mmCIF file with all atom_site columns, C-alpha atoms in Angstrom:
data_model
loop_
_atom_site.group_PDB
_atom_site.id
_atom_site.type_symbol
_atom_site.label_atom_id
_atom_site.label_alt_id
_atom_site.label_comp_id
_atom_site.label_asym_id
_atom_site.label_entity_id
_atom_site.label_seq_id
_atom_site.pdbx_PDB_ins_code
_atom_site.Cartn_x
_atom_site.Cartn_y
_atom_site.Cartn_z
_atom_site.occupancy
_atom_site.B_iso_or_equiv
_atom_site.pdbx_formal_charge
_atom_site.auth_seq_id
_atom_site.auth_comp_id
_atom_site.auth_asym_id
_atom_site.auth_atom_id
_atom_site.pdbx_PDB_model_num
ATOM 1   C CA . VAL V 1 1   ? 83.074  108.789 87.986  1.00 54.62 ? 7   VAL V CA 1
ATOM 2   C CA . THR V 1 2   ? 85.523  105.924 88.337  1.00 57.85 ? 8   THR V CA 1
ATOM 3   C CA . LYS V 1 3   ? 89.256  107.083 87.913  1.00 59.18 ? 9   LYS V CA 1
ATOM 4   C CA . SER V 1 4   ? 91.609  104.781 85.949  1.00 62.20 ? 10  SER V CA 1
ATOM 5   C CA . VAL V 1 5   ? 95.300  104.066 85.706  1.00 65.72 ? 11  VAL V CA 1
ATOM 6   C CA . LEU V 1 6   ? 97.234  101.752 83.376  1.00 64.93 ? 12  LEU V CA 1
ATOM 7   C CA . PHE V 1 7   ? 100.814 100.915 84.331  1.00 61.26 ? 13  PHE V CA 1
ATOM 8   C CA . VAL V 1 8   ? 103.070 100.078 81.383  1.00 58.55 ? 14  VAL V CA 1
ATOM 9   C CA . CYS V 1 9   ? 106.416 98.444  80.791  1.00 61.72 ? 15  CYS V CA 1
ATOM 10  C CA . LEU V 1 10  ? 107.988 96.751  77.768  1.00 62.92 ? 16  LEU V CA 1
ATOM 11  C CA . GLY V 1 11  ? 106.896 93.185  78.477  1.00 59.62 ? 17  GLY V CA 1
ATOM 12  C CA . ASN V 1 12  ? 104.299 93.506  81.287  1.00 64.20 ? 18  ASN V CA 1
ATOM 13  C CA . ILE V 1 13  ? 106.055 90.783  83.315  1.00 66.86 ? 19  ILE V CA 1
ATOM 14  C CA . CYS V 1 14  ? 108.609 92.491  85.604  1.00 67.56 ? 20  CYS V CA 1
ATOM 15  C CA . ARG V 1 15  ? 107.722 96.052  86.424  1.00 66.91 ? 21  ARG V CA 1
ATOM 16  C CA . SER V 1 16  ? 104.177 97.086  85.536  1.00 69.63 ? 22  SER V CA 1
ATOM 17  C CA . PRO V 1 17  ? 102.464 94.116  87.228  1.00 67.36 ? 23  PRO V CA 1
ATOM 18  C CA . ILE V 1 18  ? 104.172 95.116  90.513  1.00 68.10 ? 24  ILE V CA 1
ATOM 19  C CA . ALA V 1 19  ? 103.085 98.748  90.036  1.00 67.52 ? 25  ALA V CA 1
ATOM 20  C CA . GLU V 1 20  ? 99.485  97.619  89.404  1.00 69.95 ? 26  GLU V CA 1
ATOM 21  C CA . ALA V 1 21  ? 99.449  95.292  92.439  1.00 69.47 ? 27  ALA V CA 1
ATOM 22  C CA . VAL V 1 22  ? 100.993 97.987  94.757  1.00 70.26 ? 28  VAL V CA 1
ATOM 23  C CA . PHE V 1 23  ? 98.445  100.562 93.597  1.00 71.83 ? 29  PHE V CA 1
ATOM 24  C CA . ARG V 1 24  ? 95.473  98.203  93.904  1.00 74.20 ? 30  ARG V CA 1
ATOM 25  C CA . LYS V 1 25  ? 96.499  97.337  97.498  1.00 71.65 ? 31  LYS V CA 1
ATOM 26  C CA . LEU V 1 26  ? 96.899  101.033 98.305  1.00 69.26 ? 32  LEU V CA 1
ATOM 27  C CA . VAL V 1 27  ? 93.403  101.915 97.161  1.00 63.56 ? 33  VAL V CA 1
ATOM 28  C CA . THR V 1 28  ? 91.868  98.828  98.735  1.00 64.39 ? 34  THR V CA 1
ATOM 29  C CA . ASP V 1 29  ? 93.561  99.624  102.098 1.00 65.28 ? 35  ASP V CA 1
ATOM 30  C CA . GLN V 1 30  ? 92.070  103.151 101.847 1.00 62.29 ? 36  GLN V CA 1
ATOM 31  C CA . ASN V 1 31  ? 88.495  101.843 101.106 1.00 62.84 ? 37  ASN V CA 1
ATOM 32  C CA . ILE V 1 32  ? 88.410  103.326 97.632  1.00 63.39 ? 38  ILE V CA 1
ATOM 33  C CA . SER V 1 33  ? 89.152  100.397 95.256  1.00 65.53 ? 39  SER V CA 1
ATOM 34  C CA . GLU V 1 34  ? 85.667  100.734 93.953  1.00 68.01 ? 40  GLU V CA 1
ATOM 35  C CA . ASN V 1 35  ? 86.485  104.153 92.669  1.00 64.32 ? 41  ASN V CA 1
ATOM 36  C CA . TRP V 1 36  ? 89.444  102.940 90.576  1.00 64.94 ? 42  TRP V CA 1
ATOM 37  C CA . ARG V 1 37  ? 90.030  100.831 87.487  1.00 59.53 ? 43  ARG V CA 1
ATOM 38  C CA . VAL V 1 38  ? 93.619  99.616  87.735  1.00 59.82 ? 44  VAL V CA 1
ATOM 39  C CA . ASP V 1 39  ? 95.522  97.567  85.083  1.00 59.73 ? 45  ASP V CA 1
ATOM 40  C CA . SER V 1 40  ? 98.870  96.941  83.442  1.00 61.68 ? 46  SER V CA 1
ATOM 41  C CA . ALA V 1 41  ? 99.987  96.329  79.934  1.00 63.45 ? 47  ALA V CA 1
ATOM 42  C CA . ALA V 1 42  ? 103.006 96.029  77.632  1.00 61.97 ? 48  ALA V CA 1
ATOM 43  C CA . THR V 1 43  ? 104.308 98.115  74.797  1.00 59.71 ? 49  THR V CA 1
ATOM 44  C CA . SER V 1 44  ? 105.402 94.882  73.054  1.00 58.55 ? 50  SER V CA 1
ATOM 45  C CA . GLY V 1 45  ? 104.126 91.438  72.323  1.00 55.61 ? 51  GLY V CA 1
ATOM 46  C CA . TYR V 1 46  ? 107.128 89.584  73.794  1.00 50.79 ? 52  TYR V CA 1
ATOM 47  C CA . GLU V 1 47  ? 105.417 88.071  76.867  1.00 51.05 ? 53  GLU V CA 1
ATOM 48  C CA . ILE V 1 48  ? 101.720 88.039  75.979  1.00 49.66 ? 54  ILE V CA 1
ATOM 49  C CA . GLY V 1 49  ? 99.910  85.355  78.077  1.00 47.32 ? 55  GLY V CA 1
ATOM 50  C CA . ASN V 1 50  ? 102.537 85.035  80.679  1.00 45.13 ? 56  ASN V CA 1
ATOM 51  C CA . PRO V 1 51  ? 102.168 85.696  84.430  1.00 43.72 ? 57  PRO V CA 1
ATOM 52  C CA . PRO V 1 52  ? 104.511 88.081  86.210  1.00 45.43 ? 58  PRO V CA 1
ATOM 53  C CA . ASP V 1 53  ? 108.133 87.114  86.516  1.00 46.30 ? 59  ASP V CA 1
ATOM 54  C CA . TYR V 1 54  ? 108.332 84.752  89.344  1.00 44.67 ? 60  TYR V CA 1
ATOM 55  C CA . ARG V 1 55  ? 111.110 86.848  90.967  1.00 49.89 ? 61  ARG V CA 1
ATOM 56  C CA . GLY V 1 56  ? 108.519 89.553  91.189  1.00 47.92 ? 62  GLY V CA 1
ATOM 57  C CA . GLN V 1 57  ? 106.049 87.184  92.759  1.00 51.79 ? 63  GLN V CA 1
ATOM 58  C CA . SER V 1 58  ? 108.658 86.226  95.334  1.00 51.35 ? 64  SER V CA 1
ATOM 59  C CA . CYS V 1 59  ? 109.188 89.859  96.134  1.00 50.61 ? 65  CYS V CA 1
ATOM 60  C CA . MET V 1 60  ? 105.493 90.585  96.442  1.00 49.65 ? 66  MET V CA 1
ATOM 61  C CA . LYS V 1 61  ? 104.997 87.549  98.667  1.00 51.26 ? 67  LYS V CA 1
ATOM 62  C CA . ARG V 1 62  ? 107.631 88.884  101.064 1.00 50.70 ? 68  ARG V CA 1
ATOM 63  C CA . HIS V 1 63  ? 105.782 92.196  101.251 1.00 51.57 ? 69  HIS V CA 1
ATOM 64  C CA . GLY V 1 64  ? 102.283 90.709  101.608 1.00 52.25 ? 70  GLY V CA 1
ATOM 65  C CA . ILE V 1 65  ? 100.981 92.238  98.318  1.00 52.06 ? 71  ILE V CA 1
ATOM 66  C CA . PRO V 1 66  ? 98.563  90.112  96.271  1.00 53.33 ? 72  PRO V CA 1
ATOM 67  C CA . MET V 1 67  ? 99.614  89.991  92.572  1.00 56.37 ? 73  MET V CA 1
ATOM 68  C CA . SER V 1 68  ? 97.821  88.208  89.757  1.00 53.58 ? 74  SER V CA 1
ATOM 69  C CA . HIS V 1 69  ? 98.075  89.107  86.097  1.00 50.89 ? 75  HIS V CA 1
ATOM 70  C CA . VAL V 1 70  ? 98.266  87.802  82.525  1.00 48.13 ? 76  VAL V CA 1
ATOM 71  C CA . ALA V 1 71  ? 100.525 89.898  80.298  1.00 47.38 ? 77  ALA V CA 1
ATOM 72  C CA . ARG V 1 72  ? 98.736  91.822  77.540  1.00 47.50 ? 78  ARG V CA 1
ATOM 73  C CA . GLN V 1 73  ? 99.788  94.474  74.996  1.00 45.04 ? 79  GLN V CA 1
ATOM 74  C CA . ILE V 1 74  ? 98.376  97.977  75.159  1.00 43.90 ? 80  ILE V CA 1
ATOM 75  C CA . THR V 1 75  ? 95.635  98.605  72.585  1.00 41.24 ? 81  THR V CA 1
ATOM 76  C CA . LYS V 1 76  ? 94.352  101.653 70.810  1.00 41.29 ? 82  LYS V CA 1
ATOM 77  C CA . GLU V 1 77  ? 91.319  101.578 73.109  1.00 40.17 ? 83  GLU V CA 1
ATOM 78  C CA . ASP V 1 78  ? 93.409  102.040 76.210  1.00 41.70 ? 84  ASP V CA 1
ATOM 79  C CA . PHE V 1 79  ? 94.389  105.519 75.117  1.00 40.05 ? 85  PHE V CA 1
ATOM 80  C CA . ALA V 1 80  ? 90.679  106.469 75.054  1.00 38.88 ? 86  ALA V CA 1
ATOM 81  C CA . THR V 1 81  ? 89.579  104.836 78.283  1.00 41.60 ? 87  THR V CA 1
ATOM 82  C CA . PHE V 1 82  ? 92.387  105.448 80.806  1.00 43.99 ? 88  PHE V CA 1
ATOM 83  C CA . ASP V 1 83  ? 92.901  108.693 82.703  1.00 43.87 ? 89  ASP V CA 1
ATOM 84  C CA . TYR V 1 84  ? 96.579  107.974 83.253  1.00 44.46 ? 90  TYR V CA 1
ATOM 85  C CA . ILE V 1 85  ? 99.170  105.753 81.542  1.00 43.61 ? 91  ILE V CA 1
ATOM 86  C CA . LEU V 1 86  ? 102.203 105.566 83.836  1.00 39.47 ? 92  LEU V CA 1
ATOM 87  C CA . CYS V 1 87  ? 105.276 103.869 82.372  1.00 40.24 ? 93  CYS V CA 1
ATOM 88  C CA . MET V 1 88  ? 108.663 102.847 83.635  1.00 41.72 ? 94  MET V CA 1
ATOM 89  C CA . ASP V 1 89  ? 111.428 104.244 81.388  1.00 40.06 ? 95  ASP V CA 1
ATOM 90  C CA . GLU V 1 90  ? 112.032 106.725 78.649  1.00 41.49 ? 96  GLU V CA 1
ATOM 91  C CA . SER V 1 91  ? 112.002 104.039 75.909  1.00 40.53 ? 97  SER V CA 1
ATOM 92  C CA . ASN V 1 92  ? 108.486 103.107 77.089  1.00 40.77 ? 98  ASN V CA 1
ATOM 93  C CA . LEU V 1 93  ? 107.535 106.769 76.970  1.00 37.60 ? 99  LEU V CA 1
ATOM 94  C CA . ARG V 1 94  ? 108.736 107.251 73.413  1.00 36.69 ? 100 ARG V CA 1
ATOM 95  C CA . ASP V 1 95  ? 106.850 104.137 72.347  1.00 34.48 ? 101 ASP V CA 1
ATOM 96  C CA . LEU V 1 96  ? 103.674 105.123 74.082  1.00 33.09 ? 102 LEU V CA 1
ATOM 97  C CA . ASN V 1 97  ? 103.801 108.630 72.645  1.00 33.96 ? 103 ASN V CA 1
ATOM 98  C CA . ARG V 1 98  ? 104.227 107.151 69.150  1.00 33.47 ? 104 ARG V CA 1
ATOM 99  C CA . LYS V 1 99  ? 101.254 104.839 69.619  1.00 35.38 ? 105 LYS V CA 1
ATOM 100 C CA . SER V 1 100 ? 99.119  107.619 71.106  1.00 33.36 ? 106 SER V CA 1
ATOM 101 C CA . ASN V 1 101 ? 99.569  109.807 68.015  1.00 35.69 ? 107 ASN V CA 1
ATOM 102 C CA . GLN V 1 102 ? 97.994  107.035 65.862  1.00 35.89 ? 108 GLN V CA 1
ATOM 103 C CA . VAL V 1 103 ? 94.532  107.248 67.479  1.00 36.85 ? 109 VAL V CA 1
ATOM 104 C CA . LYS V 1 104 ? 91.817  109.870 67.412  1.00 35.66 ? 110 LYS V CA 1
ATOM 105 C CA . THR V 1 105 ? 90.956  109.952 71.110  1.00 38.60 ? 111 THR V CA 1
ATOM 106 C CA . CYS V 1 106 ? 93.761  110.082 73.676  1.00 38.35 ? 112 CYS V CA 1
ATOM 107 C CA . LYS V 1 107 ? 92.235  110.877 77.029  1.00 39.40 ? 113 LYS V CA 1
ATOM 108 C CA . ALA V 1 108 ? 95.189  109.506 78.854  1.00 43.02 ? 114 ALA V CA 1
ATOM 109 C CA . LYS V 1 109 ? 97.922  111.564 80.315  1.00 46.17 ? 115 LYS V CA 1
ATOM 110 C CA . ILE V 1 110 ? 101.131 109.598 79.521  1.00 46.72 ? 116 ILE V CA 1
ATOM 111 C CA . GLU V 1 111 ? 103.929 109.999 82.035  1.00 46.57 ? 117 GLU V CA 1
ATOM 112 C CA . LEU V 1 112 ? 106.815 108.275 83.795  1.00 45.99 ? 118 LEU V CA 1
ATOM 113 C CA . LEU V 1 113 ? 105.609 106.691 87.050  1.00 46.76 ? 119 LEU V CA 1
ATOM 114 C CA . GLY V 1 114 ? 108.933 107.881 88.560  1.00 48.84 ? 120 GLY V CA 1
ATOM 115 C CA . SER V 1 115 ? 107.944 111.508 87.898  1.00 49.58 ? 121 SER V CA 1
ATOM 116 C CA . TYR V 1 116 ? 105.977 111.015 91.155  1.00 51.32 ? 122 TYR V CA 1
ATOM 117 C CA . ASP V 1 117 ? 108.857 109.868 93.276  1.00 52.36 ? 123 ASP V CA 1
ATOM 118 C CA . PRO V 1 118 ? 109.609 112.312 96.088  1.00 54.23 ? 124 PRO V CA 1
ATOM 119 C CA . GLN V 1 119 ? 113.103 110.787 96.049  1.00 53.70 ? 125 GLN V CA 1
ATOM 120 C CA . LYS V 1 120 ? 113.436 111.697 92.386  1.00 54.59 ? 126 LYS V CA 1
ATOM 121 C CA . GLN V 1 121 ? 114.507 108.192 91.155  1.00 55.05 ? 127 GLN V CA 1
ATOM 122 C CA . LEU V 1 122 ? 112.991 108.893 87.855  1.00 52.44 ? 128 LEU V CA 1
ATOM 123 C CA . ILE V 1 123 ? 113.570 105.641 85.944  1.00 51.52 ? 129 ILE V CA 1
ATOM 124 C CA . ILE V 1 124 ? 112.198 102.280 87.080  1.00 50.89 ? 130 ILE V CA 1
ATOM 125 C CA . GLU V 1 125 ? 114.845 100.139 85.422  1.00 52.33 ? 131 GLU V CA 1
ATOM 126 C CA . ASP V 1 126 ? 114.207 96.760  83.795  1.00 53.81 ? 132 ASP V CA 1
ATOM 127 C CA . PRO V 1 127 ? 115.236 94.095  86.384  1.00 54.80 ? 133 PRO V CA 1
ATOM 128 C CA . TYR V 1 128 ? 114.989 91.125  84.015  1.00 55.66 ? 134 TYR V CA 1
ATOM 129 C CA . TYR V 1 129 ? 118.777 90.619  83.755  1.00 52.93 ? 135 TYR V CA 1
ATOM 130 C CA . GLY V 1 130 ? 119.316 91.585  87.392  1.00 57.70 ? 136 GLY V CA 1
ATOM 131 C CA . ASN V 1 131 ? 118.781 89.940  90.741  1.00 58.33 ? 137 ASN V CA 1
ATOM 132 C CA . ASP V 1 132 ? 116.361 89.870  93.596  1.00 56.30 ? 138 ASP V CA 1
ATOM 133 C CA . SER V 1 133 ? 117.720 93.139  94.895  1.00 53.36 ? 139 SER V CA 1
ATOM 134 C CA . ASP V 1 134 ? 116.712 94.809  91.611  1.00 54.73 ? 140 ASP V CA 1
ATOM 135 C CA . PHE V 1 135 ? 113.145 93.594  91.989  1.00 53.73 ? 141 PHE V CA 1
ATOM 136 C CA . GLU V 1 136 ? 113.154 94.949  95.514  1.00 49.85 ? 142 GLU V CA 1
ATOM 137 C CA . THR V 1 137 ? 114.254 98.368  94.227  1.00 51.92 ? 143 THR V CA 1
ATOM 138 C CA . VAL V 1 138 ? 111.433 98.275  91.665  1.00 52.88 ? 144 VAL V CA 1
ATOM 139 C CA . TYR V 1 139 ? 109.016 97.478  94.431  1.00 53.57 ? 145 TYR V CA 1
ATOM 140 C CA . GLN V 1 140 ? 110.175 100.345 96.608  1.00 53.35 ? 146 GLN V CA 1
ATOM 141 C CA . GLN V 1 141 ? 109.980 102.778 93.742  1.00 49.55 ? 147 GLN V CA 1
ATOM 142 C CA . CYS V 1 142 ? 106.452 101.650 93.021  1.00 47.95 ? 148 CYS V CA 1
ATOM 143 C CA . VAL V 1 143 ? 105.386 102.039 96.657  1.00 50.47 ? 149 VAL V CA 1
ATOM 144 C CA . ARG V 1 144 ? 106.719 105.696 96.725  1.00 50.38 ? 150 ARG V CA 1
ATOM 145 C CA . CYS V 1 145 ? 105.417 106.660 93.338  1.00 52.76 ? 151 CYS V CA 1
ATOM 146 C CA . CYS V 1 146 ? 101.982 105.083 93.741  1.00 50.15 ? 152 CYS V CA 1
ATOM 147 C CA . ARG V 1 147 ? 101.367 106.792 97.072  1.00 50.37 ? 153 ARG V CA 1
ATOM 148 C CA . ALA V 1 148 ? 102.357 110.137 95.604  1.00 50.37 ? 154 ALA V CA 1
ATOM 149 C CA . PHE V 1 149 ? 100.246 109.649 92.502  1.00 53.91 ? 155 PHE V CA 1
ATOM 150 C CA . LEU V 1 150 ? 97.249  108.715 94.627  1.00 53.15 ? 156 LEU V CA 1
ATOM 151 C CA . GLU V 1 151 ? 97.772  111.799 96.819  1.00 55.66 ? 157 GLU V CA 1
ATOM 152 C CA . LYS V 1 152 ? 97.996  114.201 93.851  1.00 54.08 ? 158 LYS V CA 1
ATOM 153 C CA . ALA V 1 153 ? 97.869  113.329 90.241  1.00 51.62 ? 159 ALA V CA 1
ATOM 154 C CA . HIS V 1 154 ? 99.762  115.613 87.895  1.00 53.13 ? 160 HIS V CA 1
#
């Protein structure tokens, strides 16, 4: 059957849209995009409707990675339909775990995306109050973690 992954951050503007776009390009480059449902969402409603932070778009454009998204908040349905929910920081994880204990069906495994990093940079830190170099770090983390996740899901 199709496999699915939902990347999650607080606002779904800085971090999770990059993770989604990196993963989608990885599976498309490996001829298996059709086997995956890939998405991103927010724990909060703070940015609903908005495209990714344009600093993130600038970073993705440098790297040649297509990125298009409209921010949305995670829903109770997403816990039933996704195989994996991969989030950025421990505050996301606590939030997601709280929301997941409010539904009947939680198929998803809920984990830090950085738990996949061979370099063991566990937290993908919010770059909103940082600079271009922070978005670049987020990017690099997502490239390492997404490849590892694709090679062997936990």
